[PDB]
Amino acid sequence: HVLKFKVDHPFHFFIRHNKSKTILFFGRFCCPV
Amino acid sequence: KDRWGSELEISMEQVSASIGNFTVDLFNKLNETNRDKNIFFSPWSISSALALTYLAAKGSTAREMAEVLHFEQAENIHSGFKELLTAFNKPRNNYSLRSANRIYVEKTYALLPTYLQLSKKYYKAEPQKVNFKTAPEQSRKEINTWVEKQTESKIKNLLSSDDVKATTRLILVNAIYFKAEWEVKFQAEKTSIQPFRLSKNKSKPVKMMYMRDTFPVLIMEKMNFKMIELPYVKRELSMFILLPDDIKDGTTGLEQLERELTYERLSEWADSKMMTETLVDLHLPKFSLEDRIDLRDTLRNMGMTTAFTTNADFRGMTDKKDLAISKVIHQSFVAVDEKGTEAVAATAVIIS
């Protein structure tokens, strides 16, 4: 059965250039607006 | 053999590793004060600007910067930055990714020609003479206009009146812009208003995007979290999301994760052999963040101190020992929606 991945509470996120594995942007989202 | 290719890939790996280590160190420092706030930054932009500054640094000023920014394992960190910059700026038609650097210098202040040629070589930074002495506002505005152009008009006023002064002699600026569609886009039809839980006792509405599709997922049962990779077009870039299994503490639910966060851990999780393609019911908020900060105090708390004092040694760019970093302004923006993501940032290292 399908895995639930519900992003409805604080998380870390980053945008990566995959070949080099360089993190271009990093953040934590914990507080809407 | 291709020792040239092998060397340059090692160079790039050094800078990527430095940026990863610096990302976690910086976040951990920012988090000490701001435990309950959104944080968003481009470690690429911050490190690039400070690397262009490091190029001019000497003695303990340089050694401190190298330690904080994690440049220690590199014989020529500037080469790795060059090669990464070239890779990011490579011409393409499937998405937007670009980064640029620039040197703004007091027209009366002479810089060493070696610094300028190396800055051009490694960072593609050209010098622009400006009148800081008797025209700070005109100089500030032209800088903000360049940054506006590099950021697709998302960062319109990087520097404020308090930042640029008559005493300002040099401003080293990096900008980065990214915009790409998801490999698989969300259908706006399936987006609905749902609660986002800030804590066990607090929630606010967000537009929650939804799709059912297959993504790489790492399930870390014993540390109560999951991580997902969300590829952009052709999977050349991705957004990674690290999500605790629930809110199992008295604040954000991230206390344990943030306590145990290291780049070693982050890195091995992101590329884990156990992160495999999984059919997922994915709910992701449509969200945007903006942030602006003077990193001076933060960087001093991390161990970069001398550069911000009268004993600062930037004799890589000048024969006079009369320069010191006054401010490190960083501004960032990101917007996540059904089509993809737009992300952009700039860093100004202000030297007096």
Fill in the amino acid letter for B128: Q
- Using CB atoms, which residue from A7, A10, A20 is nearest to B254? A10
Query: What is the rounded distance in angstroms from the CA atom of residue B29 to the CA atom of residue B261?
Result: 12
B30 within 8 A of B39, measured Cβ to Cβ: yes
Q: Which of B55, B258, B48 is nearest to A22 (CA)?
A: B48
Dihedral sign of CA atoms A16, A18, A20, A21 in order: positive
Helix/strand/coil for B230: strand
- Does the beta carbon of A1 lie under 8 angstroms from any beta carbon of chain B? no
Range of the domain at A12: 1-33
A19 within 8 A of B337, measured Cβ to Cβ: no
Query: What is the rounded distance in angstroms from the CA atom of residue B306 to the CA atom of residue B226?
Result: 41
Domains along the sequence of chain B with CATH: 1-183+286-352 (3.30.497.10), 184-285 (2.30.39.10)
β-partners of residue A14 are A26, B240
Q: What letter would DSSP give residue B232?
A: B
B44 within 8 A of A22, measured Cβ to Cβ: yes
CB < 8 Å & 24+ apart, contacts of A27-30 = A27/B38, A27/B39, A27/B40, A27/B41, A27/B289, A27/B334, A28/B27, A28/B31, A28/B38, A28/B39, A28/B40, A28/B254, A29/B38, A29/B285, A29/B287, A29/B289, A30/B36, A30/B37, A30/B38, A30/B198, A30/B252, A30/B254
Residues of B with Cβ-Cβ distance to A1 under 8 angstroms: none
Query: What is the rounded distance in angstroms from the CA atom of residue B292 to the CA atom of residue B8?
Result: 34
In chain B, breaks (C-N over 2.5 A) are found after none
Query: What is the rounded distance in angstroms from the CA atom of residue B208 to the CA atom of residue B196?
Result: 9
Say whether A14 and B23 touch across the interface (CB within 8 A). yes
CA neighbours within 13 Å on the CB side: how many for B112? 14
- Using CB atoms, which residue from B267, B289, B332 is nearest to A29? B289
Least Cα separation, residue A33 to chain B (angstroms): 8
Query: What is the rounded distance in angstroms from the CA atom of residue B328 to the CA atom of residue B164?
Result: 12
- N-to-C CA span, chain B: 47
Say whether B243 and A31 touch across the interface (CB within 8 A). no
Q: What is the largest CA-CA distance in chain A?
A: 34
Structure obtained using = X-ray
Q: What letter would DSSP give residue A13?
A: E
Query: What is the rounded distance in angstroms from the CA atom of residue B197 to the CA atom of residue B205?
Result: 9
Say whether B44 and A2 touch across the interface (CB within 8 A). no
Measured in angstroms, the resolution is 2.1
Query: What is the rounded distance in angstroms from the CA atom of residue B346 to the CA atom of residue B332?
Result: 7
Which stretches within chain B are classed as H helix? 3-33, 43-54, 59-69, 77-88, 113-123, 136-150, 255-259, 263-270, 296-302
**Total domain count for chain A?**
1
Say whether B19 and A6 touch across the interface (CB within 8 A). no
Dihedral sign of CA atoms B275, B278, B282, B288 in order: positive
Q: What token pair was written down for B83?
A: 């090669």
Dihedral sign of CA atoms B276, B25, B291, A29 in order: positive
B101 within 8 A of B126, measured Cβ to Cβ: no
Q: Which of B136, B59, B65, B72 is nearest to B104 (CA)?
A: B136
Query: What is the rounded distance in angstroms from the CA atom of residue B255 to the CA atom of residue B115?
Result: 44
Dihedral sign of CA atoms B49, B148, B43, B118 in order: negative
Neighbours of B261 (CB within 10 A): 18
Burial of B27 (0-12, 13-18, 19+ CB in 10 A): buried
